[PDB]
TrEMBL record, chain A:
<dbReference type="GO" id="GO:0046872">
    <property type="term" value="F:metal ion binding"/>
</dbReference>
<keyword id="KW-0862">Zinc</keyword>
<feature type="binding site">
    <location>
        <position position="125"/>
    </location>
    <ligand>
        <name>Zn(2+) 3</name>
    </ligand>
</feature>
<feature type="binding site">
    <location>
        <position position="70"/>
    </location>
    <ligand>
        <name>Zn(2+) 1</name>
    </ligand>
</feature>
<keyword id="KW-1035">Host cytoplasm</keyword>
<feature type="binding site">
    <location>
        <position position="154"/>
    </location>
    <ligand>
        <name>Zn(2+) 2</name>
    </ligand>
</feature>
<feature type="binding site">
    <location>
        <position position="238"/>
    </location>
    <ligand>
        <name>Zn(2+) 4</name>
    </ligand>
</feature>
<dbReference type="GO" id="GO:0030430">
    <property type="term" value="C:host cell cytoplasm"/>
</dbReference>
<feature type="binding site">
    <location>
        <position position="242"/>
    </location>
    <ligand>
        <name>Zn(2+) 5</name>
    </ligand>
</feature>
<feature type="binding site">
    <location>
        <position position="148"/>
    </location>
    <ligand>
        <name>Zn(2+) 3</name>
    </ligand>
</feature>
<keyword id="KW-0946">Virion</keyword>
<protein>
    <submittedName>
        <fullName>Capsid</fullName>
    </submittedName>
</protein>
<dbReference type="GO" id="GO:0044423">
    <property type="term" value="C:virion component"/>
</dbReference>
<feature type="domain" description="Calicivirus coat protein C-terminal">
    <location>
        <begin position="83"/>
        <end position="309"/>
    </location>
</feature>
<keyword id="KW-0479">Metal-binding</keyword>
<feature type="binding site">
    <location>
        <position position="117"/>
    </location>
    <ligand>
        <name>Zn(2+) 2</name>
    </ligand>
</feature>
<feature type="binding site">
    <location>
        <position position="119"/>
    </location>
    <ligand>
        <name>Zn(2+) 2</name>
    </ligand>
</feature>
Amino acid sequence: RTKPFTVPILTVEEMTNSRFPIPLEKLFTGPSSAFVVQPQNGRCTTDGALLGTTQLSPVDICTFRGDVTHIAGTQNYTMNLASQNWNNYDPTEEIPAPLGTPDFVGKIQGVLTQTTRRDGSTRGHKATVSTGSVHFTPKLGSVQFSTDTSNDFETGQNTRFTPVGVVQDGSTTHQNEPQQWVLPDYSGRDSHNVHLAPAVAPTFPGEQLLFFRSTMPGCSGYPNMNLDCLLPQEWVQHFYQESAPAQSDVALLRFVNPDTGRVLFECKLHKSGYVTVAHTGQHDLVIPPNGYFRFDSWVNQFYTLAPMG
Amino acid sequence: ESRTKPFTVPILTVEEMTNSRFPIPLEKLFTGPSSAFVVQPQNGRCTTDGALLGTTQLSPVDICTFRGDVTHIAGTQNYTMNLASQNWNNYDPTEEIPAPLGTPDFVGKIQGVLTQTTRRDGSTRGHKATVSTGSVHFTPKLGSVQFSTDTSNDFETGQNTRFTPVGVVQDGSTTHQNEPQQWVLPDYSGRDSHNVHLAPAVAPTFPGEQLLFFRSTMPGCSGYPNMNLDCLLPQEWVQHFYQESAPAQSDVALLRFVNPDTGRVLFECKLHKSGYVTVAHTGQHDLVIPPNGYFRFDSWVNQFYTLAPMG
Ligand SMILES: CC(=O)N[C@H]1[C@@H](O[C@H]2[C@@H](O)[C@@H](CO)O[C@@H](O)[C@@H]2O[C@@H]2O[C@@H](C)[C@@H](O)[C@@H](O)[C@@H]2O)O[C@H](CO)[C@H](O)[C@@H]1O
Ligand SMILES: CC(=O)N[C@H]1[C@@H](O[C@H]2[C@@H](O)[C@@H](CO)O[C@@H](O)[C@@H]2O[C@@H]2O[C@@H](C)[C@@H](O)[C@@H](O)[C@@H]2O)O[C@H](CO)[C@H](O)[C@@H]1O
C-alpha cells in the first residue's frame, strides 16, 4: 500500500524548537482566537512540503550572513544578506524572506563575527537586531544591527550573526516584548508580506491548538520568553525525509507513558502541519519526561478526541 | 543472510546537514592522512545501529552548551558554574560517560554568552563569557567548569544560568592558528585524573585508505585561531541511526555519493559499523561535489573490499 506515516519516537525534551535554536521544554495549550497564529518557521505538511520560511537546519534559525557597512555617526551596521552558503540572496524567489528568518517581532541579541580574508584575522561583538524596526527588510536583502563598536568590523568581509536570546526595555511594561504572534514586515513599512504559510486555527468544538513550547534566554530586561512552535524541528525534518502521503484529514497521535504503558492523551495532527487537543483553557501539560508521541491512524476531521487530562 | 529492516542514511546534501562537534552547518568534505595525530572526538560518535558513544547526545543545539548555577570568584571576573543536566536536574558524575553529554571535545577557548533569569521576577541579564577547555579549572566530569567574563557583580547565585557557544579565540601575539587544537581531548576531570569511558580513537587500517571528514569553519571572535572543525558523522546521521537502529549485517556499509540530477556516482566510501567514514586516497584533498549530491547506502561488504579510488 502507500508508504506508512510516522512521527519520530522522541520525547519532548529530546527535541528542538523550530522557531529559535534551543530545545523544547514543554507542551502548552490555550485558546487562540485573540491572536494570529501564523508563524513561518516550523511549517511543514505531514507529507513533507516545507512552507513559509522553513528550512532543515536546527541551528541556522534566526542567523544572518553577509557583508556589513558601518552607518556613520552611530554604533550600527547594515548587513547585505547572502545565502546560507555565501551565495547571493535572491529577493525574487517566491518566499516571504530568506529561509530561517526570524518570524516574530522582538529584539534578538547575539554576536556578530568576522574573519578577514587576506590574513584569517577574527573579530566578534555583541549585536542586536530589532525585527519590528523600519530597517528590518530581510526580503529586500538587508537588515540592520546595533552593536557596541564603531570601528572594528571591516567592509567586504564575511560576517555572521549568532542568535543568543531576547531583550526588553525594563522601564516599560514587563513582558511586552517580544511578540511571538506578530510577523515582522519582511520588506519594511507599507509593504505586504508575500507567500506566507497560512494562519491556522482549531476548527472543531472543544478543541485548542497544542503548542511545543520553549523558553527563550533573556539577555536584558523583563522579556516575554515564551516561544510556541507548531511542529518540533525534528518533525519537520522527519516529514521531509519520509514524504508519506496523507490518507485522510488528520493523523491521530497517542502520547504514551512508557513506564505505565498507558495512553495519556490523544491529539490530531492535521495534514498541513499542526496539532489540536480537546481542552478549554490555558494549560501547561504535566507529562512524564520519557513520554513520547506514536501515530495511530488516519481519521476524519470529525473524529472526537477524548478530553485531554 | 539475515531478514531485517534495511539500513539507510538520510537523504541530505552536505550543506543541508549540521556539524556534530559544534552547533553550526557542515560546509564541505575533506580527506587527509591522520597518523600524525589522535583522532578521538567524543561528540558525533554513534554506531551504525544506533548506540550513542562518548559524550554524544541528540540535540544539534545543545553541543558545547552548559547550564547550572553560578558563583563569583572574589577579585576576578570569573565565575564557577555547577553544571546541571540538559533538563536542569543534577549532573550525575557517576553515570558511565566521559563528561556531561554535549561537553566540548577539544582543547581551546570557546567564546559565547552567559545568560540568566531571576526566577521570582523574570529579570534577565547576559554577558560575554569564555570557557577555556584546557584550563586546570575545566572539570566537567566532576560537575564543575569556569568562565571568564566582563563583569564582577551582575550574576546572581542560585539562579538558572546558561552558556551559548558562539565561537573560538586565539592570542594574536602568539603563533597564529596555534589553538584551538581540535584533536586534543580536554582533561574532563582536571589534571591528575584520567579520562574514562571514551569512544575509541579511529584509524583507517586498510591499505590506501583515509578518513573522510565532515568539515565546518568555526566562527572566530578574536586573534588568528584555527577554525577548522572536522567530525566523523554529521549530526543528522547520529540522529537517524539512533532512531532507526537498523541491524548491521557486516562491519562495513558501502555508500555511494550520488548526483541525483544525472544519476552519476561521484565516489564511493566505507561507513564503518563503529561509526566513521574512509575513502581510497592518499594526500590532503578538498572534495569537489555537486551541491545537490548526497550519500546512498548500497550494501554491506566484508573485510576484504577495495574501494574504487576517489577522484
Ligand atoms: C544592554 C545593556 O546595556 N545592559 C547593561 C545594563 O543593564 C541594564 C540597562 O540596560 C538598563 C538601561 O537603562 O536597563 C536595565 O533593565 C538593565 O538591567 C538588566 O535587566 C535588569 C532587569 C537586571 O536583570 C539586570 O541584571 C540587567 O543588567 O547595565 C547593567 C548594569 O548592571 C549591565 O552592565 C548590563 O550589561
Ligand atoms: C576578546 C577581546 O577582548 N577582543 C577585543 C580585543 O581584540 C584584540 C585584543 O585581544 C588584542 C590583545 O591585546 O589582540 C588583538 O589582536 C585583538 O584584535 C582582534 O584580532 C585582530 C587581528 C583583529 O581581527 C581585531 O578585529 C580583533 O578584535 O580588542 C579589540 C580592539 O578593538 C576588540 O575590542 C576586541 O573585541
